[PDB]
Amino acid sequence: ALLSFERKYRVRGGTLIGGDLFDFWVGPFYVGFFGVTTAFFALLGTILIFWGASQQGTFNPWLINIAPPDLSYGLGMAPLMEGGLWQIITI
Amino acid sequence: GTGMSVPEFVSDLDTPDPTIEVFLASTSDPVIPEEGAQTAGEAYENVDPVL
Numbered sequence: 001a002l003l004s005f006e007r008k009y010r011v012r013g014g015t016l017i018g019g020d021l022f023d024f025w026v027g028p029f030y031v032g033f034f035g036v037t038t039a040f041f042a043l044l045g046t047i048l049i050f051w052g053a054s055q056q057g058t059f060n061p062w063l064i065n066i067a068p069p070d071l072s073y074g075l076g077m078a079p080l081m082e083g084g085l086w087q088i089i090t091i
Numbered sequence: 092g093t094g095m096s097v098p099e100f101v102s103d104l105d106t107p108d109p110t111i112e113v114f115l116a117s118t119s120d121p122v123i124p125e126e127g128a129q130t131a132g133e134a135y136e137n138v139d140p141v142l
Contacts (some may be wrong), residue, residue: 067092 001028001031045089 012023018033025031053064060066074082078084132142 065092071096 047086048089055081 010025012020014032015023015032022032031036031091049066052066053059055062056066058064066086066089067073067083068086069078074085077087080088130142131137
């Protein structure tokens, strides 16, 4: 659904990358190439947060905690349960 | 995740307390007393704690 004055502004063009392959709208939202990359990254991050919450043992929104690794790991990668999920979610 | 850690420069961590070396240059090993050794009070006039 459109506002009373919105139809004349919905033209084609003005994309950095993608052309008319992603040049459309879903509801009020505009999607483009960067709308597909945002959806993927955000959904993956949220699903991983809730998987970590399930493995922690609580689903209480106040008490969910996903933490970085110990200092002894330095700048390397830690096991996914001892702080690696935090690194993936940060990316 | 707590934020509980203590920070230090590595040039400061490699600099020892400078008086450790003064001590090591003023210290000696004890001398084990022998059988019936002569004490300090039988050689001078001193105070009870050190006699």
